From a paper:
We solved the crystal structure of the PPARγ LBD bound to edaglitazone at the orthosteric pocket, which unexpectedly revealed a bacterial MCFA cobound to the alternate site. Edaglitazone contains a bulky benzo[b]thiophene group adjacent to the TZD head group, in contrast to other TZD-bound PPARγ crystal structures, which have smaller moieties (e.g., phenyl) adjacent to the TZD head group. Crystals formed in the I4 space group, a different space group compared to the >150 crystal structures of PPARγ deposited in the PDB. The structure was solved at 2.1 Å as a homodimer with two molecules in the asymmetric unit (chains A and B) with the expected alpha helical sandwich fold. Strong electron density was observed for three ligands in both chain A and B molecules: one edaglitazone bound to the canonical or orthosteric pocket; a second edaglitazone to a surface pocket created through an interaction between two symmetry-related protein molecules; and a MCFA consistent with the size of a nonanoic acid (C9) molecule bound to a solvent accessible region near helix 3, the β-sheet surface of the orthosteric pocket, and the flexible Ω-loop region. The combined binding of the C9 and the second edaglitazone may have contributed to the stability of the PPARγ Ω-loop, which is often characterized with very poor or absent electron density in most published crystal structures. When bound to the orthosteric pocket, rosiglitazone and edaglitazone make conserved hydrogen bonds via the TZD head group to the side chains of S289 (helix 3), H323 (helix 5), H449 (helix 10/11), and Y473 (helix 12). The TZD head group of rosiglitazone also makes a hydrogen bond to Q286 (helix 3), which is not present in the edaglitazone-bound structure due to a 2.8 Å shift of the Q286 side chain from the rosiglitazone-bound position (5.7 Å away from the TZD 2-carbonyl position).
Thiazolidinediones (TZDs), also called glitazones, are synthetic agonists of the peroxisome proliferator-activated receptor gamma (PPARγ) nuclear receptor with potent anti-diabetic efficacy in patients with type 2 diabetes. Overall, the structure of the PPARγ LBD is described as a three-layer helical sandwich fold composed of 12 α-helices containing a dynamic or flexible internal ligand-binding pocket. The PPARγ ligand-binding pocket is among the largest in the nuclear receptor superfamily, ranging from 1200 to 1400 Å3 in crystal structures with three branches described as ‘T’ or ‘Y’ shaped. Branch I is located proximal to helix 12, which forms a critical part of the activation function-2 (AF-2) coregulator binding surface; branch II is located near the β-sheet surface, close to the predicted ligand entry/exit site where helix 3 meets helix 6 and the helix 11/12 loop; and branch III is also located near the β-sheet surface but deeper in the pocket near helix 5.
Numbering used by the authors: 207 to 477
Write the structure that this text describes.
């Protein structure tokens, strides 16, 4: 019935607001500079990156052994820390999806392990436009050109996310749409190694119905938005699997290189 589906949509939106401090709405307000609550420092080359480090307050601190004087590695570490924050936000959010916590714990672990990066890239798009991306909770704005011009493959690290984002962002979802979509991602019955797929697919069937109603009500003029959104899950998968391969190539070209321990656990036996 439609009433239960609407209550689910509201419940998920409420949980998403409690779990994710930086929402798309706040990111869009920052990106549209007519909301001059402040203004992010624009980073576009080495000098501006070094200047931004002076001006931006960083929350996360790499161990001294893993600090690098090299611009591309410091940026890489900035990205990792966004993922370490997001994994914990996503976990809190997942526990509020009805039925998730009653699943076998091993299946909960599997759904998070394989779901977090597809969500991370979904919400990364909320911080991007065709010209660049917000960094450090919106204190800075790193340009896309700059990110393309990084050495070794870090151009291949950034550009596919930008290509995804500008198309994903043309769907014009809001946070109340995204709250349901990321729950659909988590409750994926096709993750490797799942033990009881049927209880997962039964939750996802309910989430898909709530997502379908929500897009119908919230985007009445957007033709086939539901279908187009679900097709983006294919793009998201490709970004993750290509990222995983790319990381297996940086390891060869740097034996000493370091992932945050949380990302080491996520990537371990991932694909
Ligand atoms: C928070 C974090 O981020 C990363 C990481 C991020 C990006 C790439 C690779 C790794 N890993 C950790 C966990 C470990 O974080 C620490 C361990 C130990 C110390 C104390 C001295 S410093 C040193 O180098 N070894 C020590 O015992 C210190 S101090 C500030 C941190 C820290
Ligand atoms: C690009 C950038 O720079 C900074 C920054 C720079 C200096 C200081 C502070 C911040 N902020 C951002 C935005 C965040 O953009 C990302 C977040 C997370 C990921 C995924 C990780 S990175 C990895 O290898 N495994 C993961 O989970 C990836 S990937 C391409 C981008 C990306
Ligand atoms: C690693 C060089 C300095 C930047 C690291 C930024 C991580 C903290 C943050 O802004 O989220």
């Amino acid at each position: 019935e439609s009433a239960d589906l609407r209550a689910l949509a509201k419940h998920l939106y409420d949980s998403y607001i409690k779990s994710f401090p930086l929402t798309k709405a706040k990111a869009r307000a920052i990106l549209t500079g007519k909301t001059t609550d402040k203004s992010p420092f624009v980073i576009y080359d080495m000098n501006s990156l070094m200047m931004g480090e002076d001006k931006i307050k960083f929350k996360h601190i790499t161990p001294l052994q893993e600090q690098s004087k090299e611009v591309a590695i410091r940026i890489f570490q900035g990205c990792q820390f966004r993922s370490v924050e997001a994994v914990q936000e996503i976990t809190e959010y997942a526990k509020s999806i009805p039925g998730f916590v009653n699943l076998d714990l091993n299946d909960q672990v599997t759904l998070l392990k394989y779901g977090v990066h597809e969500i991370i890239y979904t919400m990364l798009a909320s911080l991007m436009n065709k010209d660049g991306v917000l960094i450090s909770e919106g204190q800075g704005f790193m340009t896309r050109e700059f990110l393309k011009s990084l050495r070794k493959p870090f151009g291949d690290f950034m550009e596919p996310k930008f290509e995804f984002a500008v198309k994903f962002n043309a769907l014009e979802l809001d946070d109340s749409d995204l709250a349901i979509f990321i729950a659909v991602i988590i409750l994926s019955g096709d993750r490797p190694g799942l033990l009881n797929v049927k209880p997962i697919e039964d939750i996802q069937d309910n989430l898909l119905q709530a997502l379908e109603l929500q897009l119908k009500l919230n985007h009445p003029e957007s033709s086939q938005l539901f279908a187009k959104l679900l097709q983006k899950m294919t793009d998201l998968r490709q970004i993750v699997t290509e990222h995983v391969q790319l990381l297996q190539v940086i390891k060869k070209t740097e034996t000493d290189m370091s992932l945050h321990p949380l990302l080491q656990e996520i990537y371990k036996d991932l694909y």
